[PDB]
């Protein structure tokens, strides 16, 4: 029974045998339980002063790898178990739940949500460009079919890159890795259809000037000159090539 | 704590670190239970987070539209993003460290990030000078060249990267003309 271990910290406060218990370390030198607890407590103070106007939309959830899985599904285009594409993921409208982080109630959902809104836009944009043929202002047009098919190709590559590169990665890594892809996606969403705060290119509604068919073979040339300033130079070159492929065929 | 710091580096002010349209991200003075020294360190970091937020807003403002205009202005925004990329990488490393030891202290982060407190302000000063003087087209190149004579080696290397992107644009235009 001699085999017990004892503390090697000897303090200058008890001159007998101290237990060794510290002073309840400071908030900023430890977290993950006290972080969330302090955040929840500050939000509780604010909710007391507000009359309970937070109501913890997803106070905690899911985990790391499961929240990452839901976010990766939303980025693929299947809305997450707390996220709808082009729809508020959480029923909290404070930046703890729309929050890169705060450890606050909803803030665990919020770190995902802040990047998620872009992913929901990406999902709806990938649906917009997923089929090469579409009703109304998108029917007929071989250059339009080529453009939409190549965009769906890139959307698919983006969706396979997500939830295949970052399995079980924290939200921060997921968002940092996907920021350079989602910004290009958002630029193309302004260029293309629904999946954006501007439906199509032009307007912000289902009556956007975005051409199709030979009208698109026009439209794209000015859109290509007028903007290529994010990451579209190789992509826009390929898109112009494939859009001209039906035009070049006809000619 | 550590997660909220990473959030602030991600540009989303929280309850302790609040976003002010005028100041950017800053530490809330009202957060109880922090020792004043901890509040001071947090606010020193929050100054960087504020500058990061403002820089991100500027980058989005001047790249996100596909008034000052030009391929040099776009290159400037791309340069700013590429200069924040090393900050993003350092933030990822800090995140991994905090995932490895949840008991890690803020002093470790402040030491690991102190170099960015010096790198970011100089580039932000140069960018704000370009903005305030409405430097346009190749005059942005002129301004960057003038700023390249600065003494900060980290700043020198960052500005060299920006200048290299701008020279790639200048050389493309020169090739087209010539």
């Amino acid at each position: 029974v001699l085999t017990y271990e004892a503390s090697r910290r000897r303090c200058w406060e008890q001159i007998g045998c101290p237990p060794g218990h510290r002073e309840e370390p400071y908030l900023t030198e430890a977290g993950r339980d006290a972080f969330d607890r302090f955040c929840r407590l500050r939000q509780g103070e604010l909710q007391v002063l507000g009359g309970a106007l937070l109501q913890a939309p997803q106070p905690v959830l899911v985990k790391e790898s499961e929240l990452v899985k839901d976010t990766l599904n939303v980025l693929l285009g299947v809305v997450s178990a707390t996220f709808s594409l082009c729809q508020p993921a959480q029923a909290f409208t404070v930046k703890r739940g729309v929050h890169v982080s705060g450890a606050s109630p909803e803030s665990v959902s919020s770190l995902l949500s802040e990047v998620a809104e872009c992913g929901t836009h990406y999902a709806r944009l990938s649906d917009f460009s997923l089929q090469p043929v579409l009703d109304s202002s998108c029917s007929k047009g071989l250059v339009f079919q080529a453009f939409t098919s190549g965009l769906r190709r890139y959307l698919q590559y983006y969706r396979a890159c997500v939830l295949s590169t970052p399995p079980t990665l924290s939200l921060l890594t997921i968002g940092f890795l996907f920021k350079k892809l989602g910004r290009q996606l958002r630029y193309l969403a302004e260029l293309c259809g629904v999946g954006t705060a501007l439906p199509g290119t032009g307007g912000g509604e289902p009556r956007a000037a975005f051409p199709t068919g030979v009208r698109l073979l026009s439209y794209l040339y000015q859109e290509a000159l007028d903007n290529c300033s994010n990451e579209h130079y190789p992509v826009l070159l390929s898109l112009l090539k494939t859009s001209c492929e039906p035009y070049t065929r006809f000619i | 704590m550590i997660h909220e710091l990473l959030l602030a580096l991600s540009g989303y002010p929280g309850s302790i670190f609040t976003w002010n349209k005028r100041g950017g991200l800053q530490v809330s003075q009202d957060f109880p239970f922090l020792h004043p020294s901890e509040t001071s360190v947090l606010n020193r970091l929050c100054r960087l987070g504020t500058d990061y937020i403002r820089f991100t807003e500027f980058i989005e403002q001047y790249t996100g539209h596909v008034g000052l205009h030009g391929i040099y202005l776009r290159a400037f925004c791309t340069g700013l993003d590429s200069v924040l990329q090393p900050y993003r990488q350092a933030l990822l490393d800090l995140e991994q460290e905090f995932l490895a030891d949840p008991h890690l202290s803020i002093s470790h982060i402040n030491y690991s990030l102190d170099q960015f407190q010096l790198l970011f302000p100089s580039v932000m000063v140069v960018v704000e000078q370009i903005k305030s003087q409405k430097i346009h087209g190749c005059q942005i190149l002129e301004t960057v060249y003038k700023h390249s004579c600065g003494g900060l080696p980290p700043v020198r290397s960052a500005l060299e990267k920006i200048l290299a992107v701008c020279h790639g644009v200048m050389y493309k235009q020169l090739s087209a003309w010539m």
Partner: peptide
């Protein structure tokens, strides 16, 4: 024309127009 920093720079259609105009003219 191409504002993304990558006739690789510069967007045009003359690399495609010339082989088409050659046959139109023929």
């Amino acid at each position: 024309v191409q504002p993304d920093t990558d006739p690789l720079p510069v967007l045009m259609k003359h690399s495609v127009t010339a082989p088409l105009a050659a046959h139109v003219s023929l």
